[PDB]
Homo-oligomer: A and B are copies of this chain.
């Protein structure tokens, strides 16, 4: 010390860190990457809740991203940006409990609102190091303190033998909670305000944000929340204690593990990480799409009851939520799983293929429930039309898994005291490599919220750069005040809060804000009110 940049030297509870000065289009940013927040969850610690990281001696280098949590790498379309952009960009390791911090350069003089990003990837994949989650633009342009963490995914994060000591479940959510705890204690050293923390996430990340809202020990660690294309409630974000027990026992059999839970978990702990990844998908109860094997469990601990019971009975008076969806939530889920669908053709399907797809898309549906889905989504004027059937299939999956669980959450939070702001993202990136029939697929709003169009080397249009700047302003104004609206800008269209009376939401596209009413109201009344009665 003494020859290095004094603006990049910081101390945390665990010790000294050395960060890196990064270039963002408009100027420098301070980045502290790969900070350890927990004891490596390896060996005897596999399946166990995280332990806080013991202090270190000397200056820890925090200039590079750390290991990505052990997961299944997508090799479906080799060289394809559409799939490769989501793949791990660092080495896979069980030693992965690290977090990243981006702050303005020089570090802010007064306490600054903090944004904590929780990534998606069906609770089996993801990393905080991906290029779409780059906090440098938000830190530079908006002056934000951005934090992102790695949490255990798959069997490593969510394999549960409910009631056991050794594998209690939801440990990946506890990794997230420990990083929220770390922010409270240490973010002030970076110029961050621990008294103004906003959680934001997408897909499984949004479901994770939702589970922090529904779990009392997490509520003291944040003030506001953003749930993008994901919710704690719904058909995929959780499993029962019985279902998690079933899936962990089946995986144990599959890898040669046999009679109490201690014996079974000890044997699972001797298995190489890849053996577990190789059998992960083989525990699903049916042929399905938008279903993940190891997800949060309703344990009676982290989740005191189902997220459905919790959202219907909870008091959310003190809460501000920003929720929303993309135009085509379900389109991507059809390419691996539904026969007749491909990214390399227009995917014009037959009626038989549509009926077959509804059984895959709604796997828990009875013959009668699936018929109600088919009859609702058929256009009885053109019941055999291949383009309509193709789109209806996308809508079934999108509506069942995302839009209607989002509408249900917005409705319940608003009715029970929260301040809700709802959106629909309708802009398809000019740079998208997925076919046009897929529209705006699941996760393709992220690059805009994070401000990637501001980098001139990424070849986005001028319109897309102005639009990204607009979105970065909505998100950070929401983090700052609990309202996405700019107080100085009187002229710009206001984003009204979502209410049960008016059911107002906005469209996020290249045009100025548009206020719309009812988030897929007739269709979501079918999924949220009728279909549960067709489970009797």
Are B378's CB and A530's CB within 8 A?
Answer: no
Q: In the complex, which residues 372-391 of chain A have their Cβ closer than 8 Å to any Cβ of chain B?
A: 372, 375, 378-381
Are B530's CB and A380's CB within 8 A?
Answer: no
Q: Which of A272-280, A317-325, A521-529 contacts B (4 or more CB under 8 A)?
A: A521-529
Kindly state whether residue A216 has any CB partner on chain B within 8 Å. no
Are B530's CB and A381's CB within 8 A?
Answer: no
What per-residue 1/0 map shows which CB atoms of A505-536 lie under 8 Å from chain B? 00000000000011001101110011001101
Kindly state whether residue A503 has any CB partner on chain B within 8 Å. yes
Kindly state whether residue A131 has any CB partner on chain B within 8 Å. no
Kindly state whether residue A466 has any CB partner on chain B within 8 Å. no
Chain B residues with CB under 8 A of A521: 380-381
Are B518's CB and A381's CB within 8 A?
Answer: yes
Q: Say what secondary structure dominates the interface of chain A.
A: helix
Q: How far is the CA of A402 from the CA of B381 in the complex (A)?
A: 20
Are A525's CB and B381's CB within 8 A?
Answer: no
Kindly state whether residue A42 has any CB partner on chain B within 8 Å. no
Chain B residues with CB under 8 A of A518: 380-381
Number of this chain's copies in the assembly equals: 2
Are B375's CB and A529's CB within 8 A?
Answer: yes
Are B517's CB and A372's CB within 8 A?
Answer: no
Are A375's CB and B530's CB within 8 A?
Answer: yes
Chain B residues with CB under 8 A of A85: none
Kindly state whether residue A5 has any CB partner on chain B within 8 Å. no
Are A381's CB and B503's CB within 8 A?
Answer: yes
Chain B residues with CB under 8 A of A61: none
Kindly state whether residue A371 has any CB partner on chain B within 8 Å. yes
Chain B residues with CB under 8 A of A380: 518, 521-522, 524-525
Q: How far is the CA of A319 from the CA of B526 in the complex (A)?
A: 40
Kindly state whether residue A356 has any CB partner on chain B within 8 Å. no
Kindly state whether residue A368 has any CB partner on chain B within 8 Å. yes
Q: How far is the CA of A518 from the CA of B522 in the complex (A)?
A: 20
| CB-contact partner of A525 in B378, B503, B517, B529, under 8 A | B378
Chain B residues with CB under 8 A of A522: 379-380
Q: A interface, how many residues as a size bin?
A: 20 to 34
The minimal Cβ–Cβ distance linking A404 to chain B, given in whole angstroms, is 12
Q: How far is the CA of A529 from the CA of B522 in the complex (A)?
A: 19
Chain B residues with CB under 8 A of A379: 522
Are B525's CB and A371's CB within 8 A?
Answer: no
Q: Which of A380, A524, A526, A536 has the most CB of B within 10 A?
A: A380
Chain B residues with CB under 8 A of A372: 530
Chain B residues with CB under 8 A of A503: 381
Chain B residues with CB under 8 A of A517: 381
Chain B residues with CB under 8 A of A529: 375
Chain B residues with CB under 8 A of A378: 525
The minimal Cβ–Cβ distance linking A36 to chain B, given in whole angstroms, is 49
Q: In the complex, which residues 480-516 of chain A have their Cβ closer than 8 Å to any Cβ of chain B?
A: 503
Quick one: closest B residue to A372, CB to CB? Answer: B530
Quick one: closest B residue to A520, CB to CB? Answer: B380
Q: How far is the CA of A372 from the CA of B524 in the complex (A)?
A: 13
Chain B residues with CB under 8 A of A530: 371-372, 375
Q: How far is the CA of A43 from the CA of B526 in the complex (A)?
A: 57
Q: How far is the CA of A215 from the CA of B526 in the complex (A)?
A: 41
Chain B residues with CB under 8 A of A375: 525-526, 529-530
Q: How far is the CA of A503 from the CA of B379 in the complex (A)?
A: 13
The minimal Cβ–Cβ distance linking A193 to chain B, given in whole angstroms, is 40
What per-residue 1/0 map shows which CB atoms of A394-408 lie under 8 Å from chain B? 000000000000000
Q: How far is the CA of A183 from the CA of B319 in the complex (A)?
A: 79
User: CB within 8 Å of B: which residues of A?
Assistant: 368, 371-372, 375, 378-381, 503, 517-518, 521-522, 524-526, 529-530, 533-534, 536
A-B contact pairs, 21 of them (CB 8 A): A368-B533, A368-B534, A368-B536, A371-B530, A371-B533, A372-B530, A375-B525, A375-B526, A375-B529, A375-B530, A378-B525, A379-B522, A380-B518, A380-B521, A380-B522, A380-B524, A380-B525, A381-B503, A381-B517, A381-B518, A381-B521
Apart from the given pairs A375-B526, A378-B525, A381-B521, 11 other A-B contacts in the complex at a CB distance below 8 Å: A368-B533, A368-B534, A371-B530, A371-B533, A372-B530, A375-B530, A380-B521, A380-B522, A380-B524, A381-B503, A381-B517
Which 3 A-B pairs give the minimum distances between C-beta atoms? Answer: A380-B521, A380-B525, A381-B518
